[PDB]
Amino acid sequence: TQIRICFVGDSFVNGTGDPECLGWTGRVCVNANKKGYDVTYYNLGIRRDTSSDIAKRWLQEVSLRLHKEYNSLVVFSFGLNDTTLENGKPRVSIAETIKNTREILTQAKKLYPVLMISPAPYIEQQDPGRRRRTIDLSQQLALVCQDLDVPYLDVFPLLEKPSVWLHEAKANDGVHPQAGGYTEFARIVENWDAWLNWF
Template sequence: MTSQPLKEIKICFLGESLVNGTGDPECLGWAGRICQDAFSKGFDITYYNLGVRRETSHELRKRWLQEVSYRLPQQYNGRLVFSFGANDTTIENGKTRVSLQDSITNLRDILTIAKDLYPVLVVSAPPIDDEGQNQRISDLSQEFASVCNQLNVPYLNVFPELIESDIWMEEVKKYDGAHPRAAGYQVFAEIVQNWQGWLNWFDG
């Protein structure tokens, strides 16, 4: 009896340091963990982590298409996962690095192109150890949800669950105020890998 061939899926994860997995001594982050989980279930995952530390949605909007096009030519079963926004909400020189309206516009511009080329998922930015910034991240996440709903792109807001996670919040606080360690990223990963939007990619 021969085993069934693995379903080949190539996935690019795009965003900032929290996509990159900064702080994880296992160098997996949440994105690596959900791909590891899918691989263990019989899927042949090619995993491209395109997270860039300190990047805002302005820079991401400029680079994503070229980087994805190199890795996911149209003949491949390519998919995209975007997760960004925390850096947009950081205060520098008395104002956020990117205004709320510009963040919304950047997401809309990215998704309008991306959804016509590949299956796309969007995951919100998680909370950090800063009450003021968390309110801005939460507000941005709600706006991003609205954009994704309008464009019919599946969206997962991880913020409410992670801000209630003792593991996530304690690791973020003890490490650098913005990033967790391995256990925190595992909590994040479990939320995503049990999300129907992600599971739909592997159904059947």
């Protein structure tokens, strides 16, 4: 089969940090290809994207890739950057994050089969509050996803130490892991029933 997949999200969807230039998204597509699927891989991750940034752009971008392509899938992963602190406040408030996510997922599912994947871990010396804010936000994402019958993958627990994810990020730029980290992410997705449902 010939599925077209759009991956929409932030740096972690882009695979920022991976010298192999695949991210997790490229790797799960390579693996679907080995299983005899014939995947068209559309990565639409953008560095620094919040839910607000995604809400503004996703439809006009995704629609051009999936126009009259009746075998298609859209995978969203965002939220990390919403909670980044600027001038002591989140880039996007939690109310806005929820609003944004509902709006994005509600419209998306009317057009395409949709999946959502949680924020992945990020440790930041100056912001010891980030982990807690991220987990609280993730639970809000899961509630939205539950209301909308959108499968939600929580990758956070399985990418925390002892995973290489946070170690590779710390050695790199503090934020983005490399090939080993993205490989671990891809394997979580490859084991997700909602993903396996397609492949």
